[PDB]
Amino acid sequence: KVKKTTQLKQMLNSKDLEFIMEAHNGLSARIVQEAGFKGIWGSGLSVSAQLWTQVVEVLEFMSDASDVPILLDADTGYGNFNNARRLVRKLEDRGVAGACLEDKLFGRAQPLADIEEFALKIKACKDSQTDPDFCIVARVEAFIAGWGLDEALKRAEAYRNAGADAILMHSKKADPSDIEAFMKAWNNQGPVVIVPTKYYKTPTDHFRDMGVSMVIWANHNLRASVSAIQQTTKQIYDDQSLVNVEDKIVSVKEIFRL
């Protein structure tokens, strides 16, 4: 069997556009695996549970419930260098395949982490790893914060030079213009991961043409689940009956299977 860390690293470096899907708990992680996805984006754990110590607990469950690699959407646990190094060790021990760290410190002109400090933090994470294939993805918020292409490129290069296995270049525009500008200036210095949530009408083949390495479908299972629960609860509250929901939900047998 191939270690999950190795599985993720192979995906980040492959010649094809890869895809990972959001999962926010044990059950959704299982569903994402059963669907055929080669990896999971671990995110929305806190909202699901309504909440670092507690977050790591859920991952162990998600990890134990799946065979495919989980890349963690980390936004806590790396406040200083000692914590960042400890975070890598904890995730490694729980079967998590990688962690995505962000330089965001929050929309124009909003602050970002000191470039040297964040690059140094990426390096510390890489030095902390015991599994050579554990992945550290560095997310750049330069475009979102209104700093232009120059700043985005400067940060992507600094983080890749520090050892990041991939750069997650983000943008909140409705079109992929920031990503296109970056890919052109980047000259393929390393794998690039994107989150097309806001520019979702972009044809996916366009990402292939740009040479993007991986696409993350970031929060749709959580959003779908909330919609379904809200609609189902309202329907039953109003009808005081199950007749209008019984045919739109899975059988109890499917639950028994799960």
Curated annotation (Swiss-Prot):
One of its GO terms (molecular function) is phosphoenolpyruvate mutase activity. Its cofactor is Mg(2+). Its EC number is 5.4.2.9. InterPro entries: ICL/PEPM (IPR039556), PEnolPyrv_PMutase_core (IPR012698), Pyrv/PenolPyrv_kinase-like_dom (IPR015813), Pyrv_kinase-like_dom_sf (IPR040442). Keywords: Isomerase, Magnesium, Metal-binding. Changing residue 102 to A: Strongly reduces enzyme activity. Pathway: Phosphorus metabolism; phosphonate biosynthesis. One of its GO terms (biological process) is organic phosphonate biosynthetic process. It catalyses: phosphoenolpyruvate + H(+) = 3-phosphonopyruvate. Changing residue 170 to A: Strongly reduces enzyme activity. It is an enzyme of class 5 (isomerase). Formation of a carbon-phosphorus bond by converting phosphoenolpyruvate (PEP) to phosphonopyruvate (P-Pyr). NCBIfam families: PEP_mutase (TIGR02320). Homotetramer. Belongs to the isocitrate lyase/PEP mutase superfamily. PEP mutase family. This is Phosphoenolpyruvate phosphomutase. It comes from Mytilus edulis (Blue mussel).
